[PDB]
Design a protein around this ligand. Structure first.
Ligand SMILES: O=c1ccn([C@@H]2O[C@H](COP(=O)(O)OP(=O)(O)OP(=O)(O)O)[C@@H](O)[C@H]2O)c(=O)[nH]1
Length: 317
């Protein structure tokens, strides 16, 4: 897997966020943080998602959250419009969202209100990123593949990027032997921490966690990932889980047999009642499995040189 790993790192270095782009987004956060602090001094504007965990590709969108504990949401929107930012305010029932698009760098940022669970799972992925240097390039390459193969559209019957990140994590914890990572949620050193009615606790003392016993290359880890979800993983029977010591959970045990969509079952590490794969339709899953099989077929090809570039060739929309 020497040559494929060489290719993997070549692509990784092209698709990852630049330090310039990251500093630009951090500068943007500080400006937005000032507009909030001038309307509500007790409120805090926190970043979450790819950018915060360091699993972001270049030209990435921002995911921000305003921590409170009530008309502050509309007031903050009005302050941002006054400051010079362009965007819209949207509220469905009691959940407001600010969606910005201008100002002085290129903008495409989303602001949520009290998405505490999201900040916490972003902490979990941040910890794993700090545990092994192979996770960041592996996650970026999977996200680049899913985007290019048109299987990263939740509103079109396929899966979210967060979904793919959990698919990678589950493989690296509970499938690959030796494991790349331990399950931090099930550590004896883990302590319960209830946030919005869910346990967000895990072992965060990474300094005491022994190093990985898995010494495989990035190229090898990726080949295994594709091979696992293409031929071994059966979505009609099993649930992707972070709550079982062996990673073994049937849909029967979970009660996810018949949000009511359980075509592909990815149980969130903290919000265990929420199936991260609820967006995946039957036809969407058919396309996902097809692309996984295609990736596997390519990687074990006996025709040299292997056209590795085809792994990221854009599929018809
Ligand atoms: O089902 C979900 C989806 C997303 N989230 C929360 O929103 C964030 C992911 O939002 P995204 O689904 O957009 O994935 P991503 O940002 O990590 O990668 P890109 O957009 O760059 O393609 C994650 O960090 C997670 O915390 C959930 O909590 N549950």
């Amino acid at each position: 897997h020497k040559e494929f790993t060489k290719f993997c790192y070549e692509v990784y270095n092209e698709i990852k966020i630049s330090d310039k782009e990251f500093k630009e987004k951090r500068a943007a956060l500080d400006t937005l943080r000032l507009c909030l602090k001038r309307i509500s001094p007790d409120a805090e504007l926190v970043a979450f998602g790819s950018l915060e965990s360091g699993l972001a590709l270049k030209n990435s969108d921002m995911d921000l959250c305003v921590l409170m504990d009530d008309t502050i949401a509309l007031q903050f929107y009005e302050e941002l419009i006054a400051e010079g930012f362009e965007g819209k305010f949207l509220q469905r029932a009691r959940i407001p969202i600010i969606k910005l698009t201008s100002d002085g760098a290129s903008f495409q940022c989303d602001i949520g209100f009290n998405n505490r669970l999201a900040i916490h799972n972003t902490l979990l992925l941040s910890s794993y990123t700090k545990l092994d240097a192979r996770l960041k390039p592996m996650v970026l390459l999977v996200k680049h593949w899913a985007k290019r193969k048109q299987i990263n559209s939740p509103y079109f019957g396929t899966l979210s990027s967060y979904g793919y990140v959990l698919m990678v994590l589950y493989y690296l914890i509970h499938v690959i032997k030796p494991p790349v990572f331990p399950n931090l949620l099930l550590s004896p050193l883990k302590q319960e921490k209830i946030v919005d009615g869910f346990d967000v606790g895990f072992d965060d003392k990474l300094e005491d966690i022994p190093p990985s016993q898995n010494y495989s290359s990035l190229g090898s880890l990726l080949h295994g990932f594709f091979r696992f979800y293409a031929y071994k993983f059966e979505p009609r029977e099993k649930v992707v889980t972070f709550r079982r010591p062996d990673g073994y959970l049937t849909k029967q045990e979970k009660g996810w047999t018949s949000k009511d969509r359980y075509i592909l079952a990815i149980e969130d590490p903290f919000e265990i009642s929420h199936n991260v794969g609820r967006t995946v339709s039957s036809s969407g899953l058919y396309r996902i499995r097809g692309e996984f099989m295609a990736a596997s077929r390519l990687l074990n090809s006996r025709s040299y040189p292997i056209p590795y570039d085809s792994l990221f060739e854009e599929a018809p929309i």
